[PDB]
Structure 1
Amino acid sequence: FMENFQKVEKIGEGTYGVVYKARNKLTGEVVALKKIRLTAIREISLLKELNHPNIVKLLDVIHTENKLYLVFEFLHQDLKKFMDASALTGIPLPLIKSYLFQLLQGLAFCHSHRVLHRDLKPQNLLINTEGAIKLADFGLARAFGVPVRTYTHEVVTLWYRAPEILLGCKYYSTAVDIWSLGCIFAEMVTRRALFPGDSEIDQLFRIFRTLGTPDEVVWPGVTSMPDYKPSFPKWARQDFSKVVPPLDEDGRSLLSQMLHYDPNKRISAKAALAHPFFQDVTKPVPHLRL
């Protein structure tokens, strides 16, 4: 239980609980220990075996008393800090293309196992010095939920929420992760958030002003969604060439397929891996200081 870990420093404050960098007192292993404060047992245990090089490995699930502990492999930096440190020059496109490629591999692995992330964002994308990028906070959303406030009452960001979630879809699909990854794709290219909304209706309207207000033509059945309103303002679609300059045509074509309104038209992770944008994909080494 907690005795075998030594708390090094606080990493971050997730929704369910606090995450610490810790040292296994017996094996010297440096891990990320998540303290979740209090069905879910069997759902978390289904993630012990969701192992993939682009998924942060869940090492052990400690269950003692009314406190639940998750032990992950430790990574030193999230994508958010790397984007901030690269804000002046921009992440080089070969590195952007490599991160997107690896995350689509990770997504394709979890969607084939019917596991959704439901909350992709730069803050839970972790990188190392070797050029790898991994998905974190994976599978916990179905185990507890995606609440509005964290345990430290911080607001959950909506910038990467798929429109079907914002429109009240109860049973969304794997396409919600492709949408979030598309928004992260755009943010890495332009060094600015694609849809930085501070409310659910502001997030939805910021999507509408960029991609046009959806209708039955582009999204069959959107007018029947639980939170759709006919009184939605009707904005025209902006051209993608102004959305993410100076991304090349391969990248803009891929991004537009990741940002399709209709979840059934949105490109899958496996299909996106065959997109010509990755014809020249490599694995560069990032410029990190730890």
Structure 2
Amino acid sequence: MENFQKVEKIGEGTYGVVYKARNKLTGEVVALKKIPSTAIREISLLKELNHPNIVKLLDVIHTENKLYLVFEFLHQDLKKFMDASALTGIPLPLIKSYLFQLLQGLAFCHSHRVLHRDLKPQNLLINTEGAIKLADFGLAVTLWYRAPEILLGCKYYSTAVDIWSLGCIFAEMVTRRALFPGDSEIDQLFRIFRTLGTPDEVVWPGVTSMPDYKPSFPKWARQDFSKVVPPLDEDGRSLLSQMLHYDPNKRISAKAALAHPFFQDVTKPVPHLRL
């Protein structure tokens, strides 16, 4: 890790801090993430997990209590791009491209039993050629993308959690505002309830016996879905509702979502990026 000149800090969670960096000898520009035997073996496995819509993990560096992951560098994240596009909106065909590629990335990881668990716009990275890629997964303060079953204390949650988060991202790209911007776990859960309606045994068998479920939860009626994402067309809306099903078992898989009618006319536009 003397092999790398830090250029700038580009990110941080509590996992670690991410820098754009330059290899002193090869000149390559990379993203360097500065972060237990179990974790070493696990991240070794993730290194083999190559797909066009997953940020490539090039190298793992374990040096004295400290662990660095060396990633390929992409040039902008989706949040910054959504903000830059905020007056105009991202054109539907590019929204659809990005949602489609993200679903290919999920299906691939999911087929390997690898989950993201913490998807958000800052983990979705774009380039000038119209690709979008997922960063930070298998690695497992923003609750906004969190699936209802995590919030209800489920211990053994599934690949469905990433479909939920990706559904909330889709809605946000379309409306140019976050769908569920909670500022606490309960606020997050109650904002979900107030839009989609308070879940019960009819729509989510077993929900009322989940660890943090309370009979005292207010009982809100579900809102009209056309009020949630105007002006998504009805195909996008149907796909969105399948991604935001309460019951993780009813919630559409990445693989099934790829086949949804919404993607019948999918293409790959290039975005206009200001770097």
Relative to the length of structure 1, the TM-score reads 0.93
Q: Within 1, Cα distance between the matches of 2:81 and 2:252?
A: 27
For residue 26 of structure 1, report the CA deviation from its aligned partner: 1.3
For residue 14 of structure 1, report the CA deviation from its aligned partner: 2.3
Question: 1:17–1:37: 8 Å Cα contact kept in structure 2?
Answer: no
Q: Within 2, Cα distance between the matches of 1:250 and 1:15?
A: 38
For residue 39 of structure 1, report the CA deviation from its aligned partner: 0.3
> Structure 1 pair 208/172, CA: closer, same or farther in 2 (3 Å)?
same
For residue 38 of structure 1, report the CA deviation from its aligned partner: 12
- What secondary structure, in the 3-state scheme, does the structure 1 residue paired with 2:212 have? coil
Question: 1:38–1:68: 8 Å Cα contact kept in structure 2?
Answer: no
Gapped regions of structure 1 (runs ≥ 5): 141-154
> Structure 1 pair 203/265, CA: closer, same or farther in 2 (3 Å)?
same
Q: Please list the CA deviations of residues 232-264 of structure 1 after superposition, one character each: whole Å capped at 9, or x if unmatched.
A: 000000010000001001000000000000000
Instruction: Identify which range, 4-13 or 71-80, moves more after superposition.
Output: 4-13
Q: Within 1, Cα distance between the matches of 2:85 and 2:36?
A: 35
The number of residue pairs the alignment matches comes to: 275
Q: Within 2, Cα distance between the matches of 1:17 and 1:123?
A: 14
Q: Within 2, Cα distance between the matches of 1:247 and 1:10?
A: 36
Question: Equivalent residues in 2 for 1:133-282 (5 A)?
Answer: 133-140=132-139, 156-282=141-267
> Structure 1 pair 264/37, CA: closer, same or farther in 2 (3 Å)?
closer
Q: After the TM superposition, which segments of 4 or more aligned residues of structure 1 sit over 2 Å from their partners?
A: none
For residue 37 of structure 1, report the CA deviation from its aligned partner: 12
Percent pairwise identity: 99
Question: Equivalent residues in 2 for 1:3-82 (5 A)?
Answer: 3-36=2-35, 39-82=38-81
Relative to the length of structure 2, the TM-score reads 0.98
Question: 1:58–1:70: 8 Å Cα contact kept in structure 2?
Answer: yes
Q: Please list the CA deviations of residues 251-280 of structure 1 after superposition, one character each: whole Å capped at 9, or x if unmatched.
A: 000000000000000000000000000000
Q: Within 1, Cα distance between the matches of 2:9 and 2:178?
A: 27
> Structure 1 pair 227/37, CA: closer, same or farther in 2 (3 Å)?
same
Q: What is the Cα-based RMSD across aligned positions, in Å? A: 1.5
- What secondary structure, in the 3-state scheme, does the structure 1 residue paired with 2:47 have? coil
Question: 1:37–1:68: 8 Å Cα contact kept in structure 2?
Answer: no
